[PDB]
Design a protein around this nucleic acid. Structure first.
Ligand SMILES: [Mg+2]
Ligand code: NA
Length: 318
DNA sequence: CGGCTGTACTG
DNA sequence: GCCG
């Protein structure tokens, strides 16, 4: 199924970029369902059947089948392509894009010349094209290795794992996500600092976007002709959290959200730090009592404790 | 009626 | 947008 989704994707993005996040979530989930459906969809009654598809989406499917068109798609605001242009700048989202629009900016030349950018947005605009591009998974390999090689030059016992789409076995990667830990659980942050320093000194790191104590995002470029600037995310964790970190950083993101949402129905909470149980939540679903951390030395343990069958990373790409 | 994941960083 |  891609006949009807292609038309939905355009509404999903229109909604997302105008900041209607939940309606856009509705569309996103429906789109997902339709894609993992075996056969093409035939009846409005078959429509409702599919979890993630209700009356409103059913009617729209019907129109796509009956008319081969979507009336809502010709009513999309003329501002949408511009809002998408703007929020493809790293560091600029829905609010900033809509503000810029209101203020009369219609193009990246307008932003470049007339807009006051944060440090992150200026780096984002500089790399606008490169950030929209995916790298072959083989290039990800060279980057993980460059990072790993450099880390292991401080403390050779450090473990570096490439995560995200790479670990899920995808042929291309939007960025490289490197997870760093140490088996003693005591080795952190003296490294993470100096590590970035050498990588920056080797000329490998071109720009910094986020520098936190355990988390880094920046821009690197491998040496040589024909190389593009790439996004590189690095996080350091204590060995205690290694498995929950690995699970999180590997994703996919829709998978993390599904997992976490299930954990919530079981009175549990899952995050990059821990899976914990006996979590106390107020009526709005917000966490109040922290509950207690459940032991989780491997990804297997996390699935198990949730009552789920183990998925290897490739089966996580939702 | 109202949640839809949970966390971190920046200014 | 969908659903419990
Ligand atoms: Mg990634
Ligand atoms: Na952005």
């Amino acid at each position: 199924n891609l006949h009807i989704t292609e038309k939905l994707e355009v509404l999903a993005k229109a909604y997302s970029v105008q900041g209607d996040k939940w309606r856009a979530l509705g569309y996103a989930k429906a789109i997902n369902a339709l894609k993992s459906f075996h056969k093409p969809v035939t009846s409005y009654q078959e429509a409702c059947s599919i979890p993630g598809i209700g009356k409103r989406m059913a009617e729209k499917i019907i129109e796509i089948l009956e008319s081969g068109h979507l009336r809502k798609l010709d009513h999309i605001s003329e501002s949408v392509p511009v809002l998408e242009l703007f929020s493809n700048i790293w560091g600029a989202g829905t609010k900033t894009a809509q503000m810029w629009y209101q203020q009369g900016f219609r193009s990246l030349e307008d932003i470049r010349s007339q807009a006051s950018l944060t440090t992150q947005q200026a780096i984002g605009l500089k790399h606008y094209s490169d950030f929209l591009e995916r790298m072959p998974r083989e290039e990800a390999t060279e980057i993980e290795q460059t990072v790993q090689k450099a880390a292991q030059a401080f403390n050779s016992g450090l473990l570096c794992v490439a995560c995200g789409s790479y670990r899920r076995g995808k042929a291309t990667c939007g960025d490289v996500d490197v997870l760093i830990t140490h088996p003693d659980g005591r080795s952190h942050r003296g490294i993470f600092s100096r590590l970035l320093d050498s990588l920056r000194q080797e000329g490998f790191l071109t720009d910094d976007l986020v520098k936190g104590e355990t988390k880094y995002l920046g821009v690197c470029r491998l040496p040589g002709p024909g190389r593009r600037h790439r996004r590189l995310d690095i996080i350091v964790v204590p060995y205690s959290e290694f498995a929950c970190a690995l699970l999180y950083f590997t994703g996919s993101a829709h998978f993390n959200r599904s997992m976490r949402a299930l954990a919530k129905t079981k009175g549990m909470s899952l995050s990059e730090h821990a899976l914990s149980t006996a979590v106390v939540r107020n009526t709005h679903g917000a966490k109040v009592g922290p509950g207690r951390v459940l032991p989780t030395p491997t990804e297997k343990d996390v699935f198990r404790l949730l009552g789920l069958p183990y998925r290897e990373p490739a089966e996580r790409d939702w």
